[PDB]
Amino acid sequence: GPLESQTRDLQGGKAFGLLKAQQEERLDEINKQFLDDPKYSSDEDLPSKLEGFKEKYMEFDLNGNGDIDIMSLKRMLEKLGVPKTHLELKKLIGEVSSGSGETFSYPDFLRMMLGKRSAILKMILMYEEKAREKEKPTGPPAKKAISELP
């Protein structure tokens, strides 16, 4: 749709608008846990793509769970000018999420890339293989609570 101009909306509160900020810790946790997993602790390109994906994952909106739907993912392509059909996005994400279909998670995307390939989105992700080397200490908000469904 119409997304070309960068509207600089600025958040500033405590938690809601700070999703993009707070999630970095989580992203670094997830990279590190896969990086230091004995299976993946072998490839030099391995930590690189972890950070590359980390860089790119946060380029999306990142919902309340740090998740990305077929909507937020397509927000990227429409902003960048590259058009695709929703059926394609849903196919790609439905590959990663397997049963969900419309929303994927950061570790699942890594399961798919680090496994071998299943979702074509790996191709576009690793096409622009830009990385960094950042680190942020594992700060996990446990928040273990019993959420009973009415």
Curated annotation (Swiss-Prot):
Modified residues (Phosphoserine): 42
Location of this chain's protein in the cell: Cytoplasm, Cytoskeleton; Cell projection, Ruffle membrane; Cell projection, Phagocytic cup
Domain of life (superkingdom): Eukaryota
MF (Gene Ontology): actin filament binding; calcium ion binding
Topology in membrane: Peripheral membrane protein
Keyword Repeat among UniProt keywords: yes
Modified residues (N-acetylserine): 5
GO cellular component terms, A-Z: actin filament; cytoplasm; cytosol; glial cell projection; lamellipodium; nucleus; perinuclear region of cytoplasm; phagocytic cup
UniProt entry tagged with the keyword Acetylation: yes
SUPFAM superfamilies for the chain: EF-hand (SSF47473)
Tissue expression remark: Detected in T-lymphocytes and peripheral blood mononuclear cells.
Pfam families hit by this protein: AIF-1
InterPro entries linked to this entry: AIF-1_EF_pair, AIF1/AIF1L, EF-hand-dom_pair, EF_hand_dom
Keywords assigned by UniProt, alphabetized: Acetylation, Actin-binding, Calcium, Cell membrane, Cell projection, Cytoplasm, Cytoskeleton, Membrane, Metal-binding, Phosphoprotein, Repeat
Region (Disordered): 131-150
One biological process term in Gene Ontology: parallel actin filament bundle assembly
Domain EF-hand: residue ranges: 48-83, 84-118
Residue sites binding Ca(2+) 2 per the record: 103, 108
Modified residues (N6-acetyllysine): 14
PTM notes: Phosphorylated on serine residues.
Record: residues binding Ca(2+) 1: 61, 63, 65, 67
Main location: cytoplasm
Functional note: Actin-binding protein that enhances membrane ruffling and RAC activation. Enhances the actin-bundling activity of LCP1. Binds calcium. Plays a role in RAC signaling and in phagocytosis. May play a role in macrophage activation and function. Promotes the proliferation of vascular smooth muscle cells and of T-lymphocytes. Enhances lymphocyte migration. Plays a role in vascular inflammation.
Subunit details: Homodimer (Potential). Monomer. Interacts with LCP1.
Name by which UniProt lists this protein: Allograft inflammatory factor 1
Source species: Homo sapiens
